[PDB]
């Protein structure tokens, strides 16, 4: 009884965002892969540090809340203000949408980039069950499983 | 203020080296001192306390907008260096992957 990411995500995985869950003579093991999870975290961070950046343009008063201005000039100010409100509100909702899609698709990319690495490692010694696991056709003790994780499997 | 008279205040900017000439024979409120500008400031209108303990850079009538987030849904008239006012109250940026729960078997 063990499964991969083609199905569901593991909730027991807490050292990182991706990991190996193996099964052999000595039993189950769940250990995160550090390189892949940092590569995902460091790109979401790259987004934050680009959008959190501040604007250094200072705007002053042109309206007057206490003492109203000419109806014409005020109406035109209101017209411009509400028009700018519409642009930023649009540019905002879209940016969140795009970056949320690029974020979601970013993490999926790094899961496969790890799955397709372990695949080339095992060469002709294992098969794809189809659910994100590898049926290994040779006895693999707890030491051999860790050789797959730290990229030493021969 | 009990007086049905009215005083109309006018103003002009006298260029350096220029002269303003007043010719009158009554009904003239006269200037005693001319005013000169000092430096840079920022005019805000408000209705809340001043607080020298907290440091801020964005002002609306209800106080100070202190934030790193690029948007704000507080006041469309805030002055200073401010986040952009947007119609929406909340826009959630994903900082994590798609959450797919787990099932036992």
């Amino acid at each position: 009884a063990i499964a991969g990411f083609i199905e569901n995500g593991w909730e027991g995985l807490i050292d990182g965002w991706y990991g190996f869950r193996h099964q052999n003579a000595q039993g189950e093991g769940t250990a995160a892969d550090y390189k892949s999870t940092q590569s995902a975290i460091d790109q979401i961070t790259g987004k934050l540090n680009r959008l959190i950046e501040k604007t250094n343009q200072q705007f002053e008063l042109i309206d007057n809340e206490f003492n109203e201005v000419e109806k014409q000039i005020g109406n035109v100010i209101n017209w411009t203000r509400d028009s700018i409100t519409e642009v930023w509100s649009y540019n905002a909702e879209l940016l969140v949408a795009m970056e949320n899609q690029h974020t979601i698709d970013l993490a999926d990319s790094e899961m496969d980039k790890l799955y397709e690495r372990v695949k080339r490692q095992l060469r002709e010694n294992a098969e794809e069950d189809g659910t994100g696991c590898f049926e290994i056709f040779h006895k693999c003790d707890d030491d051999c499983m860790a050789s797959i994780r730290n990229n030493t499997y021969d | 203020n009990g007086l049905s008279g009215r005083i109309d205040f006018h103003w002009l900017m006298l260029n350096p080296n220029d002269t303003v000439t007043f010719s009158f024979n009554g009904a003239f409120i006269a200037p005693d001192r001319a005013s000169f500008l000092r430096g840079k400031s920022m005019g805000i209108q408000s209705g809340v306390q001043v607080d020298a303990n907290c440091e801020g850079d964005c002002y609306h009538s209800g106080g100070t907008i202190i934030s790193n987030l690029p948007f704000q849904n507080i006041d469309s008239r805030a002055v200073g260096k401010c986040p952009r006012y947007v119609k929406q109250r909340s826009l959630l940026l994903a900082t994590g992957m798609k959450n797919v729960p787990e099932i036992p078997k």
Partner: antibody, heavy 127, light 113 residues
Framework: QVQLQESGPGLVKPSETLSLTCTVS????????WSWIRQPAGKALEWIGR???????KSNPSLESRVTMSLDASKDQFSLKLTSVTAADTAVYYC?????????????????????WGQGALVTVSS | DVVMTQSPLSLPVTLGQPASISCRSS???????????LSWFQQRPGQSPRRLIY???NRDSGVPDRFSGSGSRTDFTLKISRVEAEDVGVYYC?????????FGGGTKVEIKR
């Protein structure tokens, strides 16, 4: 109620294995991030690496080829080994600890906080 | 590597006067958890450095009132409200968001008495 005490040779020969060890007083090693920060004679602080129980010796690239960290949970001592030592590795070697929240999944992928420090050990590298 | 640059590099102040220290990072220091991890460290004569400010603004417990941290995402400032004779020493800033931990050059504060 926690204290970190460095210990080890005061001088190590050029190309030896500089070894040091931070002994923990009044706390469990299992519950912290463990950093080694070295300060050469009158220079900026240099952060060597950090480890935590269950292993993850994340280290600075300048020294990663030569750094080796491990920590014993029964003797309560962070340890450190810098192989092939140079005159550049002559420095004060403070060890440091940082809070470790098990559930903060995103905390293992961020440099650890530097909550507590030791007195610092001088390792002069000469012959 | 994130580059921590402090200024000034020697800050002689007058016993009981205020002063500030600017630390500019080569990169933004935000993290996924919403906190920007900049810290300020004070290393006094012949001692281990101790942490004054963590997370840009939060002051650590057991530290004089006059230490208040501030900053944005690239530009940060340590403010001392009233430097007394006991604040002599070297002051560092460290980013704590990006591998590896990096420290500022350090500012030498010497009291003018």
């Amino acid at each position: 109620q926690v204290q970190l005490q460095e210990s080890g040779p005061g001088l190590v020969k050029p190309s030896e294995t500089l070894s040091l060890t931070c002994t923990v007083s009044g706390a469990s090693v299992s519950s912290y991030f463990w950093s080694w920060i070295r300060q050469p004679a009158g220079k900026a602080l240099e952060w060597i690496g950090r480890i935590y129980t269950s292993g993850n010796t994340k280290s600075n690239p300048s020294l990663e080829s030569r750094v080796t960290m491990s920590l014993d949970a029964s003797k309560d001592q962070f340890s450190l080994k810098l192989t092939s030592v140079t005159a550049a590795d002559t420095a004060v070697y403070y060890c440091a600890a940082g809070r470790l929240d098990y559930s903060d999944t995103t905390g293992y992928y961020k440099p650890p906080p530097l909550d507590y420090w030791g007195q610092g050990a001088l390792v002069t590298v000469s012959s | 590597d994130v580059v921590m640059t402090q200024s000034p590099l020697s800050l002689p102040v007058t016993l009981g006067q205020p002063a500030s220290i600017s630390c500019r990072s080569s990169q933004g220091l935000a993290f996924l958890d919403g906190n920007t991890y900049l810290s300020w460290f004070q290393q006094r004569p012949g001692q281990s450095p101790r942490r004054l400010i963590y997370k840009v603004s939060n002051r650590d417990s057991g530290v004089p009132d006059r230490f208040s941290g501030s900053g944005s995402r690239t530009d940060f400032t340590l403010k001392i409200s009233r430097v007394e004779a006991e604040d002599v020493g070297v002051y560092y800033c460290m980013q704590g968001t990006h591998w590896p931990l990096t420290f500022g050059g350090g500012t030498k504060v010497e009291i003018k008495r």
